[PDB]
Design a binder for this molecule. Sequence first.
Ligand SMILES: *[C@@H]1O[C@H](CO)[C@@H](O[C@@H]2O[C@H](CO)[C@@H](O)[C@H](O)[C@H]2NC(C)=O)[C@H](O)[C@H]1NC(C)=O
Ligand SMILES: *[C@@H]1O[C@H](CO)[C@@H](O)[C@H](O)[C@H]1NC(C)=O
Ligand SMILES: CNCc1nn(C)c2ccccc12
Ligand SMILES: CNCc1nn(C)c2ccccc12
Ligand SMILES: CNCc1nn(C)c2ccccc12
Ligand SMILES: [Cl-]
Ligand SMILES: [Fe+3]
Ligand SMILES: [Fe+3]
Ligand code: NA
Length: 302
Amino acid sequence: PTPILRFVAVGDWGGVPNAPFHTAREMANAKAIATTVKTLGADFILSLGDNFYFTGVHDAKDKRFQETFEDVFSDPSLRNVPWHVLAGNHDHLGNVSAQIAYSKISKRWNFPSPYYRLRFKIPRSNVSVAIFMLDTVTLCGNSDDFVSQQPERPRNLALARTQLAWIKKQLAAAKEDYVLVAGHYPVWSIAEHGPTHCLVKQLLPLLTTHKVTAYLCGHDHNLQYLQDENGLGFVLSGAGNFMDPSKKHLRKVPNGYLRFHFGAENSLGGFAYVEITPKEMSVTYIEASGKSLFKTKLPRRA
Ligand SMILES: *[C@@H]1O[C@H](CO)[C@@H](O[C@@H]2O[C@H](CO)[C@@H](O)[C@H](O)[C@H]2NC(C)=O)[C@H](O)[C@H]1NC(C)=O
Ligand SMILES: *[C@@H]1O[C@H](CO)[C@@H](O)[C@H](O)[C@H]1NC(C)=O
Ligand SMILES: CNCc1nn(C)c2ccccc12
Ligand SMILES: CNCc1nn(C)c2ccccc12
Ligand SMILES: CNCc1nn(C)c2ccccc12
Ligand SMILES: [Cl-]
Ligand SMILES: [Fe+3]
Ligand SMILES: [Fe+3]
Ligand code: NA
């Protein structure tokens, strides 16, 4: 066969704080992710943040971990698939240290620190993949701290500077055949929040300079694929719980960058399915109904 690494990227799936602690959308995506894993396989699942609506969890023993996560994603095919997690703005209104500590309670939950590096070998090959999981809230500010619901400035300047220095160092030294970067906030998005100026200003030049394959995010509650004139990809998968049809920020993205968008208000949402082989990275957007909406490939760089 062809060596392949496969994973699901889902964002903004965090249910609700009132009973039954999930939405119809979250359950449809849990069912649809289970079908994809059953039929096509997943080595892991990437959460793009906003893991517990609307104010996160209060400590590692918070019931929401079982009510909104464990019990929800409980279908047989999903039961032992590892999750690699980062935080969104609603998580940061609550206790993010609790979500990190929860890694030692639940085997499949992996969240060792606010930001960190993942390394993978495509099985049966020497081809390698690095994913850098970012905390865009501590870097840019918590959008929910502001009436604008934009991340206007970071809560702690040292922590922000420290993370940016780490990204810069890691991206310059990364030797892997594929490099992905993931964060809750978008770089580009046509939808209700739109582009994050903090990330456009500070992260995007690093993605370009160091030849990153793609940036993955959620935060806007819809599905988008964007690509710039250099081939850098932007996978936005933020439709695990909510579907916002907004195109408020369409004119804030450079012309031609938007290659796909799905935001239908009546849809149950969806997620992204990533396949990386020694020849290409493929991304398939899958609606909670099971249907494939869009597929695109990003070539390997030598
Ligand atoms: C955030 O969550 C962490 C982790 O659950 C809490 O840390 C716990 O705090 C109390 C004692 O201070 C005990 O339950 C444990 O000894 C602590 N666990 C760890 C891993 O440190 C922390 O108190 C929470 N913070 C807030 C503000 O709620
Ligand atoms: C990596 O593995 C591929 C397998 O096709 C091989 O072509 C290449 O020589 C290897 N690179 C090395 C050994 O540096
Ligand atoms: C903790 N700081 C919050 C804050 N600062 N500023 C200037 C604001 C303006 C509008 C809404 C919220 C804020
Ligand atoms: C397409 N809308 C661009 C825009 N202009 N302004 C003043 C904003 C304030 C908050 C969020 C977005 C915007
Ligand atoms: C329905 N929300 C996403 C969406 N907007 N538009 C104008 C589309 C056209 C074709 C396929 C999908 C879409
Ligand atoms: Cl912004
Ligand atoms: Fe969200
Ligand atoms: Fe968010
Ligand atoms: Na917090």
